Structure formats: structure tokens, C-alpha cells
Design an enzyme around this catalytic site. Sequence first.
Site, short mmCIF file in Angstrom:
data_model
loop_
_atom_site.label_atom_id
_atom_site.label_comp_id
_atom_site.label_asym_id
_atom_site.label_seq_id
_atom_site.Cartn_x
_atom_site.Cartn_y
_atom_site.Cartn_z
N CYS A 235 3.39 2.06 9.37
CA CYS A 235 3.39 0.88 8.46
C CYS A 235 4.71 0.25 7.98
O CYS A 235 5.53 1.15 7.68
CB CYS A 235 2.31 1.33 7.11
SG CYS A 235 0.51 1.31 7.67
N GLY B 121 2.43 7.12 10.03
CA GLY B 121 3.68 6.63 9.22
C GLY B 121 4.06 5.24 9.58
O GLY B 121 5.28 4.80 9.40
N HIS C 35 0.79 -1.22 -0.02
CA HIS C 35 0.17 0.02 -0.01
C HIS C 35 0.82 1.15 0.01
O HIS C 35 0.23 2.57 -0.18
CB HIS C 35 -1.14 0.06 0.99
CG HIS C 35 -0.74 0.17 2.53
ND1 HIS C 35 -0.54 1.47 3.01
CD2 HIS C 35 -0.89 -0.60 3.70
CE1 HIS C 35 -0.18 1.21 4.24
NE2 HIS C 35 -0.36 -0.01 4.79
#
EC number: 3.4.19.12
Lengths: 303, 302
Positions: free
Chosen positions: B144, B142, B40
Site C-alpha cells: 500500500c 506491505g 489506512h
Amino acid sequence: SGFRKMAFPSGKVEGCMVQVTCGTTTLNGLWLDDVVYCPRHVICTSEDMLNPNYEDLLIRKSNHNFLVQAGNVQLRVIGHSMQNCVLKLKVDTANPKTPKYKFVRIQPGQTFSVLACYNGSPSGVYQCAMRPNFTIKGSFLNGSCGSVGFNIDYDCVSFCYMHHMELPTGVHAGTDLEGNFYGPFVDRQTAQAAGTDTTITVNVLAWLYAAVINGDRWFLNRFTTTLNDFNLVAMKYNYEPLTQDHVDILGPLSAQTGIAVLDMCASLKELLQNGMNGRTILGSALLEDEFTPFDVVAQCAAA
Amino acid sequence: GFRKMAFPSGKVEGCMVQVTCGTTTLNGLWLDDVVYCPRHVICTSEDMLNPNYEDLLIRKSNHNFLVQAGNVQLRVIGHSMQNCVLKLKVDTANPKTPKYKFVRIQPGQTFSVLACYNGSPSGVYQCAMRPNFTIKGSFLNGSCGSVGFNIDYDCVSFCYMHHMELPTGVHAGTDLEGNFYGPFVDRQTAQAAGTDTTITVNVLAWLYAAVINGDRWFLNRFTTTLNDFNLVAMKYNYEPLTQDHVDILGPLSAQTGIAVLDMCASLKELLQNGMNGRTILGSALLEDEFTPFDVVAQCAAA
């Protein structure tokens, strides 16, 4: 989102941990810039610990009686000095992995990360608080002495704690890195009284703000209170008195949430008087005092 | 004493990088000339509502992936999608690659998370894979590509990569081959986690930990059977206890001299009567985030 008791990354400190042996006893040391810091009780036998005269015990030792190992590699000791309750072993080679660092004496209620170590080897990392009575509730088995506590501001490692002693009650005591005990404690195996522990009020309030930020809001009530009124309740429940310094420190969290500090104190009062009635806050059925206001902001801002 | 303890994070610190693609920045894991990150990274906010990952990835070339490790820029010479992870082949092997494995863990197993923003370590904490395959972490915008891991010793077993926060505020993610733990997908949609249950074997381990540390008030005068206990367990949304679980508790049974089924009888009474405002190892509720291996390890000093 979400809220966790989080330690600083330990990599910088991992590279500073060594083993220190002297006669029979083995424990952990901290290697920075050609000096190894460790607990002076490394020179003691079990019998010595009952009533040590550290000057007289240290006189029977020379540089060559201190075996300092880093991984497989031995360091050569070219100097030994006793500063309060720490031993400073001057070695021939600077630690190539020395980070930017400071030594700080922290205040009761401040938090830090512990790297628990055995035989100079890292076991694990956890966050804890210096209690108002200057003890900590760590996890420390027999070889853990010389394990260190630290904060990172960024790039710079501020070492604040070295582990020395488990008290008969199973709580822990130790020094700053100049070898001064936090609290009234001594490096002697004797009965030693920790005083009454109290809850760190300013930290509980910070953790309630953390709760509101993460969506846990049920405990926001319909009341307010004064500083004196609140502190009256606080003293009954063995909470630390809240001062205006503490109100000032909570200011940013007050601003972020739109919940005034004295309104949050009113909520805390009701939780004190009524308990939590089978509910939780951030998955805890007790009031957490191991987050500072700076810890909450940092975790929520993503430092 | 007894503490929720994470593994030392140093080995994993040296593997964290920043990965940027168009607008979005997140974390990646650099091992042996490959960078792993959440696929993603290629999505805009609009894309995340209904992503066609194949069609989005087709518009990307190697030069559209900015990979930074500290100050050092890495040149990407290859990109591929494996399930929900992107593998970016880079020109340089990570000099700090530790001994490592990729493991798919079981519900109820624990691991250490190193939370990272812009490829930089923020903090380390221990948590458990819930029986419903979610975790209750701390993960801001942020985060991920932050990873979960165990260390057996010298070897780092990577088990988790963070991908998603669900509408309920719990977290979901993959193993390092990009397969989701649980039924989840990398799409911003309503997604049902099933019923969460307590990890019974872990609660029992933690009670053994309590006895070892001197907390003994909850030891009662009863025993029970496996089926009798599991009857109570299902009522309180506790995981069924099996003989495998009894076997894994064996060493703690041996150390304490408290038979596993006797400890289950104690737990049953705590379930039925609550804790009456008392604490065990400084917790006023039953802790299920320590495995039997975690308790032994902490008590033995690995």
C-alpha cells in the site's frame, strides 16, 4: 496477491547510461568507475558491418575519435581497448553514480531486466529470459545497441548483457560485459542461424507453482509421473530436459505448496497433451517460461 | 520486436519513503516537503472492518507518524486528510523531487507501477486501469502507498496510489488527491466491481503493432461500419468504439495503410472465429494493455 512480469528498479543503471559517438555511428555506453563499455561496432559504417576487420578498423581510431557524452557533459577519453566484442574507453572522471556492481555471465534460461536506451537516454524497462538458443526476444530499434541487461541481488547490480545485434529473424543477440557473445553469434551483418528454440521447463514449473500460490489451481490433475517419463513427453514438445538439479531448485516451492515436483510435472504433461482447452493460467493462454524459480520466490516473498 | 515496457523508475525511486503509525507500516510518496500515503496507515486490522477515519485521525499527533527515507528520519510538523490520502508535512523538502503533476487518468489508460515494501523499491511493471476501475497488479501485504505514473519526458505524472486488494484478488486505489478510481472505499468489506470489458481501442492498437512487426495472418478481406462492429463488440464485452478512438488510431492507420474500419473487420473475425490456436506477437489471446500512444512511442523510440 497477483503475479506480474516485473523488472528490477532501473534507477541505479539509469545513472550509468551515456552516449558514445565514433564518426557517423551513435549508440549507448555504460559508465562505471572511469571506464565506458560499449559495442565495438560503434567504429563501423554500414558498409564495414558486412565484413569488419575490427583490428584494422580500430587502428584508424585514436582516443579523440570517441565522443562520449553524459547528459550535456562531455567526458575526455584517455585510453581505448578492445576486449572481445566490447570497447573499453578509459575516461578522466569516475562516474559519481557508479553503484556496487559485478559482471556475470548468466546461463540459458536465467532472466534479467533490460533498460532500453536511445542516444544514451532511458526509454523503458522490461524483463526477459536468455533463451536456450542464447537469443532474446526484446524490443530494440536502431539506436538501442549498448543497452544493458542486469539483476539486482540487493545494493549490488550484476550486469549480464549488452545488446549488439538484431538477427534477420528479428530476435536479438549480445554479449556479457567482458564482450563474449552469448551463443554462436558474431558482430557482423550476415545471415546467422539461431538454432531451435525450446521451452525452459524448470521456469514453466515455477510459473505453475506461482499460479497455485495465487489461487489458479484448475490444472492440478489426478496423475503423477517419473522424471524419465516426463522428459520423454518434454522432448516431443521441444521442452528442455528436466534434471535433478532442477527438481532441487523447485524444492522450496514444492514445500510452500505441498505439491511434489513430480506431481507438478504430471500436470504439465497433461497441459502439453491436451492444451489449455480455452482456459487461462495467471491470465495467459500459453505456458510462460520467463520466470525462474528464484523470480517466483522473490516476487512472492517481496524481496 | 514488441514488449510490455515500463517507464524507467529512477525518478520515482528517490520519492519512496516508509510511513509507520502505531502497528502498521506502508509506503509514502515524498515530494516538496509533503509525504502522501494511504489514510489506512492509522488503522489496525480490527479498524479496517469499519473505520471512522475522522475519529481515528483525532487520536493521532504529528509525533505518532514515523517517516523514514533510507536511513534518514523526517520530522513531521503537520498532518491532514484529503479524501483517502494522508498529507504529512515534513521539515525537509525532498532534494530529489522531480518535475511532477497529479493526473486522474481514464479507464483504459496505462501506467507503470513501482511496487514497494517498507519504503523500498521491489520492482516495476506496466498495467492498465480496467473499464471497471480495478487493476490486476502484484501487491503483497506491505505494498500500500506504491504509486503508478507516466513520464512525458522530464515530468512525472502520478496517477495512482495503491490502497486495497478486493476479495476477488483485484486491486483498487486512488489518484494522488485521494479520490478512489471506481466505486470503492478503504474498508475491508465485500465490494462489487462491475462487469469488466476489453479495451477495444487498445486491442486495435496492438493489432497495428503486430502488422508493423510482420504478424499479418489475421488481416482478412472484409470491412465493416462503426455501428456494425459495436454490435459485435457489445456481445463479446468489448468497449464501444467511437470516432475519438478512430482519430487516435489515425497515425497507425497512416503508417500501415490499413484503414481503421478494415482493422475492425479483422478484429470482428477474431472475435467470432477465435484464434484457432495461433498467436499474435507471442500472445494466444487479444492484448488490451497497450494504448495507441504506447504502441507509437515504443515503435518510434521515445
